[PDB]
């Protein structure tokens, strides 16, 4: 078999941009709602229009962090709590795999649209700030690079 | 990863209609029994006769919802509790995957027949109303659209 | 040919949505100006962007309705009367065929743009309300349907 | 540059049954509503399920019949007058061609369903009974005939 | 190559019309002579000229009917009794197979000619009326159906 | 070319279900009318819709049974006696072959329709109950069997 | 690839019979031992000799049923408890998949042999009767159907 | 056909063993039940397992034997008389052909099984012993013969 | 036959320029004579020499405009009235199609020549100014575009 | 293609000569009868023998000309009025198309024969002279041109 | 689709020998160390040299056995406890799959070498003797069988 | 068509070096940070430059070790605790599989670079020294061997 000695590969023409975001303190049963921030290289107008494919979200916690942590990506919610009822995937620290793979939830959208989305983060017990790092990995159309110099020479 | 990366795709000629339904409060060990309601676009007579393929059911809970939730789709039962003994699949919040995929349970039936089915929902502890959203996804034959204008020009 | 025992067919990839609108009373020589309202199924954002092809407009009158009725589709006019001077087609009750087939007038536009258009309706004599039904048939790109279930199975 | 000495021909597998119905006296501006009666040979159960294709309706009037006659086929109406506002075709004595060709209005239905339809007939002036014959021509799937003798030589 | 569970099939282009006729009381040794009556659908002039192939005749008696019954088809006879001496086949209740198959007796003739023929029915003992049903099955050229609508347009 | 040592075989896709029914006492010249009862395995809804082909009926009598026995299958009759006048085949104990083979009488119908039929049984003399066994053999479309295990291994 | 939206299919020539059995009350730490009962259609001698392939066993429990349930299929045991030490598979309610798939344990045996086997059912706590339904699914060689009528027509 | 001067031939690999059995006196309306006895050559163990195909039974009576004789082969009956109601074929002296050809009744069984069958013989009048010879002809798989000498000369 | 949903297409190499002109008041039975004015883009010398193909002229009137309107294109006339006696086509408001298609009248001429032509417009009753819009559609050789930049870099 | 974008073309070898003729005053209900005059170029003997194909006649009226005009081409008539009863085509100002196309009326004849024909022109009301121009278009064999200079040498 | 319905198959040339061993009482936190004993058929010298492939070890416990059991195969250890720190696989009762598959740990070794290995068995709580059966399955090269009879014929 | 009977294999040209490291006592909630030490054979300069592929890390614990252990490989950290928030994989004793497979984290790096990495090891409860063995398996380019002798022979 090809087993899990191989990572999941991006589709032709796309590449994967990965970045993280540190949590803010969170009180028991609360649900913070941090927002997505594109990495500088992708903030240009030319790029904010690159089409998205799959999106992965996983958590990095301090070994000490006790309790249960859940997270997900969804559009701005009237009620934070509610995000988890409509999100198409949820990273949950109590499961074997603590990750959320959005296979089609944002396929077709473009970077930038990601800016209108939010990352809801819940904790069953009080958790210090910076105690949870939220990793985000976005598969998107590969950005294009300049192939010509400025036409200086007359 | 290598666990997947791709969603399960519909068969040729079919498409997937998805819709949800919010729960009503539910007391410890109880088993409510809400019923299936087709989306308006599928309520026409022409459509209520489209053949069903696979059916998927999953749950969206508030992070806070404690206890164990189980749900399933089966025919009207004399005893709610009993649905879980004959249902060919059960969505269970304590498992890795909280979903129920009915591969052949309703294959061949038609929308509308779905109206005579029910969604049984159990909870091991008291649960507020609206605390559980039941998502239902039905793979059915794709409906037909008009290819001709009214023959006006004589 | 030897005659038309066949209706005019929608081009490949498109389908035809048909709907109607009832008239409001109209006084002799007057020109009412009702507006286009997309059918619910087509009001979604995803759909309001489907491209239009041909558009057909025809009238259904009570047998009793005396006088002459004329109708057409054009952009909002400063002067109702004037619509008929620029409309590329006019349904006129006095002709053999009381219909207006806009072959290219709106080709390329999208549903929704149709919301900024108007249906001008003129009558040479007084006409009760509901005495004229305006049938509208729009050929547009066929809307898309979901082909994948939600990725649940890990 | 084609021709007009050829009638419109039934599609493969179908044939055309024709029959008529005489009118009842009708008062000025009135709208009688006679109903469809299948010919005896088509009243069997085996036949009442043969699928319909196109349907043609034309009028035969006495030369003397003055005024304007209109007719059409539509489902039972709350208001007779209104049939003409929704009918997909109308036979009108004032036009060049006094006939109504329903190209798809009943395509797919079956004989017998035709029994639930009605023929609305309007006259702008008083018209004696029997002064108008309503011809109806239905293209339907060709009925099957017995190919075997009763098995007696056994 | 096995048994014989197949009925005798009509030749290409032909079909088989079947109909019956009830008997009138008949006294011992008497010979009634009922006449052939085409079924309504075949009474038209167009049809009365369809060519005949084979003709079969069989009897349906009440279980009680005692005695011997004989029947046949032949031209009008000066003497009823005599029909049986020239008929090319006779249905006889005392035989294994109570039927008469006229293979060529009327081949070539046409329906209608059948009107000039008679069905002689003999009984060795008194028999109540309606106690014998005479079944007649005629293989004839398949009647033609209309492939064209009235050239109503032009 | 001999005498036939082969039974008549079912058509491709069909199989033959056989079952019997014991008679009730029957008085001289009387005609009892027992009804068809499908075998349990065929009583399901899925099966009651399997299309019928040929049907065979034969009788098993006690050696002692004297007199003449006749039987047949036909639709419910106003008059039992009359069944024999319209039945397309009759099993008669006085013939060489005491059986009735309905080659097309029920071809096309489905099991269950058979429930609306009857078995008329006549005797010329008094006959004890259970003295006649009526064998029925129906050729019908072969039922379908489950090819998949319940998808438990999610 | 990435998904389980298809059930496990029976091998060529085999089909899957499914049936259930309700439990009897069971006291804490006890191990009941119900026995296999073939469905009526499979009780014939012809069938009790059909060869077995794979055998699947799964449990249906009332949502309320607390504690741990284990079940399995093995030959009659001197000591019920011991069945679980030799059974080649065990359905255990505490696992993700509560089922037991005997891939080769009974391959080669025949139905009927299954009659000499037993279903051992253990519970860690007291359980009411009928609170556990034991589903059994046997893949076996497809039974044969009659292809010939009785040889009546000599 | 055009060749009734040929007997029915055994299928490839099989041969036909024929033997007889003389009757015992039989009183009016009685039904004796003699049993099948394989011929010595077929009594070995190796042979009693040869598979059977078709079985024919015919009667040889003294010219004088008056009355009606009936015979058949069926499994041991509680009531002799009853054999004739279930036997799939009956030799009857009053018919044209006094024989019973069991086409499939015992196909598949093996010689020896024939030992558990019986020959029921009925007579409408008193019949002396030895007045009826019952011929039995069994088509079975051809027995094998020894091709090697004992390896004495070693 | 279908295709009544297609506009007449411009020949290879040509395109269609469309523009309008508003009428000036016109007194009963009078005949105004406005002149053709090329659109700015076509006024260049390079363009005024593009060859013309077909020319179409149609009218846009206020619904209210009563009376009869006629129009046409012809060379400057000594007598306006007379234009209509020599024009090869006339747009007439009383006809089914109110348009004038000059198929060859100006084929071969060039834009600019069109400047020496006139549009004669007649009205049977007084008509306000701006009450009639005269649409003019000219099929002409597609103008050529510049393919080189100015030669500066030399 | 679209009969409204293309004119009717002459057949191979032929060309079309067109010319007109002005009317003379005409009194109500009267029928003038002007005659055909070939154009000078066609008056030569060589030409007056060129064979004719189709002939078209259409009218050019002053906008003012009220009433109904009819015209046609036929042989000299004893009674002008009568021309219209035998002419194979009539130009009638009250129709959609005011033209008369003689498809075969003069096919075969030659120019010059046209000199023996007449143009009958009727008016329902008084009409000034010159108020109606009669256009005549004759398709005839193409005259031949001189290919040689005058031999002025040796 | 290649694992839950199919068992893991031995490689070409190898077969799988399976056998078990019963446990000895074990005290809380203790670690017994039983040894491997080849089955008699494999104890010959010829066999003790057959090469090993994969080795599987799984456990069969009484349903009652509470606590946590762990087991594994490793070389004789100075400290039993330590076996678990170097074993390449461990069967642990607390996991979903209680088995240890040594894919290459002993590949290349031979039976007999297995005699120098040990099975370490740990329990978190006291466990009666015989309460745990240790199943061992060894894939090894298929032994050779005798192909010749002793040569007694000189 | 089997399952989990194979081990993940090194890519072409690479091989896998495995070695271990014993832990040092660790206090509750503490996180020790041992460092990577290449095996002697890999310490040469020639080798320290061999490129790495995948890296696997798994734990071997004493059965007694209670509490939760977590481990991972990452670059030297300012804060030990933090390693677990950025490591791309973590071996966690509470999961089903206690291992960490770094698929690409160090792909491309070289042995030696591994020397600048660290193994962070956390424990939720106090753990004796040597109680945890950390297994490390590195897939790297296969080192080369000497193919020549020293050229001593001139």
PDB file of N, CA, C and O in Angstrom, chain B residues 4 7-10 15-16 18 54 56 58 96-97 99 101 137 139 142 145-150 152-154, chain C residues 7-10 14-16 18 54 56 58 96-97 99 101 137 139 142 145-150 152-154:
ATOM      1  N   UNK B   4      -7.414  10.871   3.231  1.00  0.00           N
ATOM      2  CA  UNK B   4      -8.390  11.161   2.166  1.00  0.00           C
ATOM      3  C   UNK B   4      -8.017  12.327   1.216  1.00  0.00           C
ATOM      4  O   UNK B   4      -7.237  12.143   0.266  1.00  0.00           O
ATOM      5  N   UNK B   7     -13.821  14.246  -1.276  1.00  0.00           N
ATOM      6  CA  UNK B   7     -15.146  13.933  -0.746  1.00  0.00           C
ATOM      7  C   UNK B   7     -15.770  12.826  -1.572  1.00  0.00           C
ATOM      8  O   UNK B   7     -15.298  12.522  -2.666  1.00  0.00           O
ATOM      9  N   UNK B   8     -16.827  12.217  -1.052  1.00  0.00           N
ATOM     10  CA  UNK B   8     -17.488  11.144  -1.782  1.00  0.00           C
ATOM     11  C   UNK B   8     -18.399  11.779  -2.848  1.00  0.00           C
ATOM     12  O   UNK B   8     -19.266  12.607  -2.551  1.00  0.00           O
ATOM     13  N   UNK B   9     -18.181  11.405  -4.103  1.00  0.00           N
ATOM     14  CA  UNK B   9     -18.942  11.992  -5.197  1.00  0.00           C
ATOM     15  C   UNK B   9     -20.196  11.266  -5.619  1.00  0.00           C
ATOM     16  O   UNK B   9     -20.240  10.040  -5.603  1.00  0.00           O
ATOM     17  N   UNK B  10     -21.206  12.032  -6.032  1.00  0.00           N
ATOM     18  CA  UNK B  10     -22.481  11.469  -6.480  1.00  0.00           C
ATOM     19  C   UNK B  10     -22.313  10.607  -7.738  1.00  0.00           C
ATOM     20  O   UNK B  10     -21.312  10.725  -8.452  1.00  0.00           O
ATOM     21  N   UNK B  15     -27.590  14.206  -8.179  1.00  0.00           N
ATOM     22  CA  UNK B  15     -27.014  15.382  -7.555  1.00  0.00           C
ATOM     23  C   UNK B  15     -27.344  15.269  -6.057  1.00  0.00           C
ATOM     24  O   UNK B  15     -28.110  14.401  -5.651  1.00  0.00           O
ATOM     25  N   UNK B  16     -26.791  16.141  -5.232  1.00  0.00           N
ATOM     26  CA  UNK B  16     -27.038  16.036  -3.817  1.00  0.00           C
ATOM     27  C   UNK B  16     -27.692  17.252  -3.203  1.00  0.00           C
ATOM     28  O   UNK B  16     -27.161  18.356  -3.263  1.00  0.00           O
ATOM     29  N   UNK B  18     -28.929  19.202   0.094  1.00  0.00           N
ATOM     30  CA  UNK B  18     -28.601  19.224   1.503  1.00  0.00           C
ATOM     31  C   UNK B  18     -29.462  20.222   2.220  1.00  0.00           C
ATOM     32  O   UNK B  18     -29.735  21.285   1.689  1.00  0.00           O
ATOM     33  N   UNK B  54     -27.980   7.449  -2.245  1.00  0.00           N
ATOM     34  CA  UNK B  54     -27.444   7.327  -0.896  1.00  0.00           C
ATOM     35  C   UNK B  54     -27.965   8.444  -0.037  1.00  0.00           C
ATOM     36  O   UNK B  54     -28.399   9.456  -0.553  1.00  0.00           O
ATOM     37  N   UNK B  56     -26.926  10.680   3.614  1.00  0.00           N
ATOM     38  CA  UNK B  56     -25.958  10.943   4.674  1.00  0.00           C
ATOM     39  C   UNK B  56     -26.556  11.818   5.742  1.00  0.00           C
ATOM     40  O   UNK B  56     -27.246  12.776   5.440  1.00  0.00           O
ATOM     41  N   UNK B  58     -25.498  13.883   9.418  1.00  0.00           N
ATOM     42  CA  UNK B  58     -24.478  14.209  10.388  1.00  0.00           C
ATOM     43  C   UNK B  58     -24.970  15.263  11.362  1.00  0.00           C
ATOM     44  O   UNK B  58     -25.961  15.930  11.098  1.00  0.00           O
ATOM     45  N   UNK B  96     -15.284   8.595  16.343  1.00  0.00           N
ATOM     46  CA  UNK B  96     -14.352   9.453  15.619  1.00  0.00           C
ATOM     47  C   UNK B  96     -15.072  10.227  14.547  1.00  0.00           C
ATOM     48  O   UNK B  96     -14.835  11.420  14.354  1.00  0.00           O
ATOM     49  N   UNK B  97     -15.941   9.514  13.837  1.00  0.00           N
ATOM     50  CA  UNK B  97     -16.768  10.093  12.782  1.00  0.00           C
ATOM     51  C   UNK B  97     -18.230  10.128  13.254  1.00  0.00           C
ATOM     52  O   UNK B  97     -18.853   9.084  13.443  1.00  0.00           O
ATOM     53  N   UNK B  99     -21.237  10.508  11.952  1.00  0.00           N
ATOM     54  CA  UNK B  99     -22.112  10.558  10.796  1.00  0.00           C
ATOM     55  C   UNK B  99     -22.718   9.203  10.527  1.00  0.00           C
ATOM     56  O   UNK B  99     -22.240   8.192  11.024  1.00  0.00           O
ATOM     57  N   UNK B 101     -24.016   7.015   7.196  1.00  0.00           N
ATOM     58  CA  UNK B 101     -24.132   6.937   5.757  1.00  0.00           C
ATOM     59  C   UNK B 101     -24.987   5.745   5.383  1.00  0.00           C
ATOM     60  O   UNK B 101     -24.570   4.603   5.561  1.00  0.00           O
ATOM     61  N   UNK B 137     -28.323  14.897   3.925  1.00  0.00           N
ATOM     62  CA  UNK B 137     -27.863  15.050   2.566  1.00  0.00           C
ATOM     63  C   UNK B 137     -28.372  13.906   1.725  1.00  0.00           C
ATOM     64  O   UNK B 137     -28.003  12.753   1.946  1.00  0.00           O
ATOM     65  N   UNK B 139     -28.832  12.095  -1.984  1.00  0.00           N
ATOM     66  CA  UNK B 139     -28.379  11.938  -3.349  1.00  0.00           C
ATOM     67  C   UNK B 139     -29.596  11.429  -4.082  1.00  0.00           C
ATOM     68  O   UNK B 139     -30.139  10.393  -3.727  1.00  0.00           O
ATOM     69  N   UNK B 142     -31.309  13.853 -10.641  1.00  0.00           N
ATOM     70  CA  UNK B 142     -31.352  15.277 -10.947  1.00  0.00           C
ATOM     71  C   UNK B 142     -32.678  15.677 -11.640  1.00  0.00           C
ATOM     72  O   UNK B 142     -33.053  15.060 -12.637  1.00  0.00           O
ATOM     73  N   UNK B 145     -35.406  20.286 -16.546  1.00  0.00           N
ATOM     74  CA  UNK B 145     -35.738  21.668 -16.874  1.00  0.00           C
ATOM     75  C   UNK B 145     -36.269  21.783 -18.294  1.00  0.00           C
ATOM     76  O   UNK B 145     -35.859  21.025 -19.166  1.00  0.00           O
ATOM     77  N   UNK B 146     -37.159  22.748 -18.508  1.00  0.00           N
ATOM     78  CA  UNK B 146     -37.787  23.013 -19.798  1.00  0.00           C
ATOM     79  C   UNK B 146     -36.783  23.420 -20.881  1.00  0.00           C
ATOM     80  O   UNK B 146     -35.995  24.344 -20.676  1.00  0.00           O
ATOM     81  N   UNK B 147     -36.817  22.748 -22.034  1.00  0.00           N
ATOM     82  CA  UNK B 147     -35.891  23.054 -23.129  1.00  0.00           C
ATOM     83  C   UNK B 147     -36.536  23.769 -24.276  1.00  0.00           C
ATOM     84  O   UNK B 147     -35.883  24.021 -25.287  1.00  0.00           O
ATOM     85  N   UNK B 148     -37.818  24.077 -24.130  1.00  0.00           N
ATOM     86  CA  UNK B 148     -38.548  24.720 -25.197  1.00  0.00           C
ATOM     87  C   UNK B 148     -39.365  25.897 -24.774  1.00  0.00           C
ATOM     88  O   UNK B 148     -39.991  25.882 -23.727  1.00  0.00           O
ATOM     89  N   UNK B 149     -39.361  26.915 -25.619  1.00  0.00           N
ATOM     90  CA  UNK B 149     -40.166  28.095 -25.394  1.00  0.00           C
ATOM     91  C   UNK B 149     -41.610  27.688 -25.703  1.00  0.00           C
ATOM     92  O   UNK B 149     -41.854  26.635 -26.287  1.00  0.00           O
ATOM     93  N   UNK B 150     -42.572  28.507 -25.313  1.00  0.00           N
ATOM     94  CA  UNK B 150     -43.946  28.211 -25.651  1.00  0.00           C
ATOM     95  C   UNK B 150     -43.978  28.427 -27.164  1.00  0.00           C
ATOM     96  O   UNK B 150     -43.384  29.367 -27.673  1.00  0.00           O
ATOM     97  N   UNK B 152     -45.088  30.085 -29.623  1.00  0.00           N
ATOM     98  CA  UNK B 152     -45.912  31.246 -29.912  1.00  0.00           C
ATOM     99  C   UNK B 152     -45.905  31.651 -31.353  1.00  0.00           C
ATOM    100  O   UNK B 152     -46.963  31.885 -31.942  1.00  0.00           O
ATOM    101  N   UNK B 153     -44.711  31.757 -31.921  1.00  0.00           N
ATOM    102  CA  UNK B 153     -44.621  32.151 -33.308  1.00  0.00           C
ATOM    103  C   UNK B 153     -45.264  31.111 -34.226  1.00  0.00           C
ATOM    104  O   UNK B 153     -44.609  30.502 -35.081  1.00  0.00           O
ATOM    105  N   UNK B 154     -46.573  30.949 -34.026  1.00  0.00           N
ATOM    106  CA  UNK B 154     -47.400  30.014 -34.772  1.00  0.00           C
ATOM    107  C   UNK B 154     -46.863  28.588 -34.677  1.00  0.00           C
ATOM    108  O   UNK B 154     -47.534  27.737 -34.038  1.00  0.00           O
TER     109      UNK B 154
ATOM    110  N   UNK C   7     -41.570  23.355 -31.410  1.00  0.00           N
ATOM    111  CA  UNK C   7     -41.305  24.584 -30.666  1.00  0.00           C
ATOM    112  C   UNK C   7     -39.837  24.965 -30.829  1.00  0.00           C
ATOM    113  O   UNK C   7     -39.024  24.148 -31.263  1.00  0.00           O
ATOM    114  N   UNK C   8     -39.492  26.203 -30.499  1.00  0.00           N
ATOM    115  CA  UNK C   8     -38.110  26.640 -30.626  1.00  0.00           C
ATOM    116  C   UNK C   8     -37.312  26.184 -29.384  1.00  0.00           C
ATOM    117  O   UNK C   8     -37.648  26.514 -28.245  1.00  0.00           O
ATOM    118  N   UNK C   9     -36.256  25.407 -29.625  1.00  0.00           N
ATOM    119  CA  UNK C   9     -35.422  24.839 -28.558  1.00  0.00           C
ATOM    120  C   UNK C   9     -34.259  25.653 -27.964  1.00  0.00           C
ATOM    121  O   UNK C   9     -33.560  26.383 -28.669  1.00  0.00           O
ATOM    122  N   UNK C  10     -34.049  25.483 -26.656  1.00  0.00           N
ATOM    123  CA  UNK C  10     -32.991  26.177 -25.914  1.00  0.00           C
ATOM    124  C   UNK C  10     -31.613  25.704 -26.327  1.00  0.00           C
ATOM    125  O   UNK C  10     -31.389  24.507 -26.497  1.00  0.00           O
ATOM    126  N   UNK C  14     -28.233  25.654 -21.739  1.00  0.00           N
ATOM    127  CA  UNK C  14     -29.244  26.538 -21.188  1.00  0.00           C
ATOM    128  C   UNK C  14     -30.575  25.838 -21.012  1.00  0.00           C
ATOM    129  O   UNK C  14     -30.809  24.753 -21.555  1.00  0.00           O
ATOM    130  N   UNK C  15     -31.449  26.465 -20.241  1.00  0.00           N
ATOM    131  CA  UNK C  15     -32.780  25.940 -20.034  1.00  0.00           C
ATOM    132  C   UNK C  15     -33.708  27.153 -20.013  1.00  0.00           C
ATOM    133  O   UNK C  15     -33.256  28.293 -20.041  1.00  0.00           O
ATOM    134  N   UNK C  16     -35.006  26.927 -19.950  1.00  0.00           N
ATOM    135  CA  UNK C  16     -35.912  28.054 -19.987  1.00  0.00           C
ATOM    136  C   UNK C  16     -36.808  28.177 -18.768  1.00  0.00           C
ATOM    137  O   UNK C  16     -37.580  27.276 -18.455  1.00  0.00           O
ATOM    138  N   UNK C  18     -39.920  29.941 -16.928  1.00  0.00           N
ATOM    139  CA  UNK C  18     -41.106  30.668 -17.306  1.00  0.00           C
ATOM    140  C   UNK C  18     -41.880  31.085 -16.078  1.00  0.00           C
ATOM    141  O   UNK C  18     -41.950  30.338 -15.113  1.00  0.00           O
ATOM    142  N   UNK C  54     -31.934  34.180 -24.895  1.00  0.00           N
ATOM    143  CA  UNK C  54     -33.067  34.835 -25.506  1.00  0.00           C
ATOM    144  C   UNK C  54     -34.161  35.060 -24.477  1.00  0.00           C
ATOM    145  O   UNK C  54     -34.191  34.391 -23.465  1.00  0.00           O
ATOM    146  N   UNK C  56     -38.500  35.763 -24.221  1.00  0.00           N
ATOM    147  CA  UNK C  56     -39.773  35.818 -24.914  1.00  0.00           C
ATOM    148  C   UNK C  56     -40.836  36.384 -24.005  1.00  0.00           C
ATOM    149  O   UNK C  56     -40.891  36.055 -22.832  1.00  0.00           O
ATOM    150  N   UNK C  58     -45.097  37.182 -23.965  1.00  0.00           N
ATOM    151  CA  UNK C  58     -46.375  37.082 -24.653  1.00  0.00           C
ATOM    152  C   UNK C  58     -47.504  37.422 -23.709  1.00  0.00           C
ATOM    153  O   UNK C  58     -47.312  37.421 -22.495  1.00  0.00           O
ATOM    154  N   UNK C  96     -50.981  39.080 -35.788  1.00  0.00           N
ATOM    155  CA  UNK C  96     -51.280  37.650 -35.879  1.00  0.00           C
ATOM    156  C   UNK C  96     -50.665  36.927 -34.701  1.00  0.00           C
ATOM    157  O   UNK C  96     -51.297  36.074 -34.080  1.00  0.00           O
ATOM    158  N   UNK C  97     -49.414  37.280 -34.413  1.00  0.00           N
ATOM    159  CA  UNK C  97     -48.663  36.697 -33.311  1.00  0.00           C
ATOM    160  C   UNK C  97     -48.471  37.767 -32.251  1.00  0.00           C
ATOM    161  O   UNK C  97     -47.745  38.730 -32.465  1.00  0.00           O
ATOM    162  N   UNK C  99     -46.666  38.405 -29.530  1.00  0.00           N
ATOM    163  CA  UNK C  99     -45.507  38.068 -28.723  1.00  0.00           C
ATOM    164  C   UNK C  99     -44.310  38.927 -29.111  1.00  0.00           C
ATOM    165  O   UNK C  99     -44.290  39.539 -30.176  1.00  0.00           O
ATOM    166  N   UNK C 101     -40.136  38.522 -29.141  1.00  0.00           N
ATOM    167  CA  UNK C 101     -38.969  37.671 -28.963  1.00  0.00           C
ATOM    168  C   UNK C 101     -37.696  38.500 -29.045  1.00  0.00           C
ATOM    169  O   UNK C 101     -37.310  38.958 -30.112  1.00  0.00           O
ATOM    170  N   UNK C 137     -40.586  34.427 -20.553  1.00  0.00           N
ATOM    171  CA  UNK C 137     -39.828  33.196 -20.650  1.00  0.00           C
ATOM    172  C   UNK C 137     -38.382  33.531 -20.906  1.00  0.00           C
ATOM    173  O   UNK C 137     -38.042  34.106 -21.933  1.00  0.00           O
ATOM    174  N   UNK C 139     -34.430  32.305 -21.326  1.00  0.00           N
ATOM    175  CA  UNK C 139     -33.486  31.233 -21.612  1.00  0.00           C
ATOM    176  C   UNK C 139     -32.201  31.685 -20.936  1.00  0.00           C
ATOM    177  O   UNK C 139     -31.688  32.763 -21.235  1.00  0.00           O
ATOM    178  N   UNK C 142     -28.056  26.997 -17.380  1.00  0.00           N
ATOM    179  CA  UNK C 142     -28.607  26.054 -16.415  1.00  0.00           C
ATOM    180  C   UNK C 142     -27.842  26.149 -15.081  1.00  0.00           C
ATOM    181  O   UNK C 142     -26.615  26.060 -15.073  1.00  0.00           O
ATOM    182  N   UNK C 145     -25.539  22.139  -9.607  1.00  0.00           N
ATOM    183  CA  UNK C 145     -25.908  21.362  -8.436  1.00  0.00           C
ATOM    184  C   UNK C 145     -24.706  20.661  -7.838  1.00  0.00           C
ATOM    185  O   UNK C 145     -23.763  20.285  -8.538  1.00  0.00           O
ATOM    186  N   UNK C 146     -24.792  20.477  -6.527  1.00  0.00           N
ATOM    187  CA  UNK C 146     -23.786  19.845  -5.706  1.00  0.00           C
ATOM    188  C   UNK C 146     -23.523  18.406  -6.106  1.00  0.00           C
ATOM    189  O   UNK C 146     -24.446  17.619  -6.197  1.00  0.00           O
ATOM    190  N   UNK C 147     -22.268  18.046  -6.331  1.00  0.00           N
ATOM    191  CA  UNK C 147     -21.956  16.675  -6.713  1.00  0.00           C
ATOM    192  C   UNK C 147     -21.259  15.893  -5.637  1.00  0.00           C
ATOM    193  O   UNK C 147     -20.992  14.705  -5.820  1.00  0.00           O
ATOM    194  N   UNK C 148     -20.931  16.545  -4.528  1.00  0.00           N
ATOM    195  CA  UNK C 148     -20.232  15.844  -3.471  1.00  0.00           C
ATOM    196  C   UNK C 148     -20.885  15.958  -2.120  1.00  0.00           C
ATOM    197  O   UNK C 148     -21.405  17.007  -1.771  1.00  0.00           O
ATOM    198  N   UNK C 149     -20.842  14.877  -1.355  1.00  0.00           N
ATOM    199  CA  UNK C 149     -21.371  14.907  -0.009  1.00  0.00           C
ATOM    200  C   UNK C 149     -20.381  15.707   0.813  1.00  0.00           C
ATOM    201  O   UNK C 149     -19.306  16.076   0.336  1.00  0.00           O
ATOM    202  N   UNK C 150     -20.739  15.970   2.060  1.00  0.00           N
ATOM    203  CA  UNK C 150     -19.845  16.681   2.947  1.00  0.00           C
ATOM    204  C   UNK C 150     -18.750  15.681   3.322  1.00  0.00           C
ATOM    205  O   UNK C 150     -19.007  14.505   3.535  1.00  0.00           O
ATOM    206  N   UNK C 152     -17.169  13.674   5.487  1.00  0.00           N
ATOM    207  CA  UNK C 152     -17.298  13.321   6.888  1.00  0.00           C
ATOM    208  C   UNK C 152     -16.314  12.241   7.281  1.00  0.00           C
ATOM    209  O   UNK C 152     -15.517  12.430   8.211  1.00  0.00           O
ATOM    210  N   UNK C 153     -16.387  11.117   6.564  1.00  0.00           N
ATOM    211  CA  UNK C 153     -15.511   9.964   6.783  1.00  0.00           C
ATOM    212  C   UNK C 153     -14.031  10.351   6.877  1.00  0.00           C
ATOM    213  O   UNK C 153     -13.238  10.085   5.969  1.00  0.00           O
ATOM    214  N   UNK C 154     -13.684  10.971   8.002  1.00  0.00           N
ATOM    215  CA  UNK C 154     -12.331  11.427   8.286  1.00  0.00           C
ATOM    216  C   UNK C 154     -11.706  12.041   7.030  1.00  0.00           C
ATOM    217  O   UNK C 154     -10.598  11.581   6.653  1.00  0.00           O
TER     218      UNK C 154
END
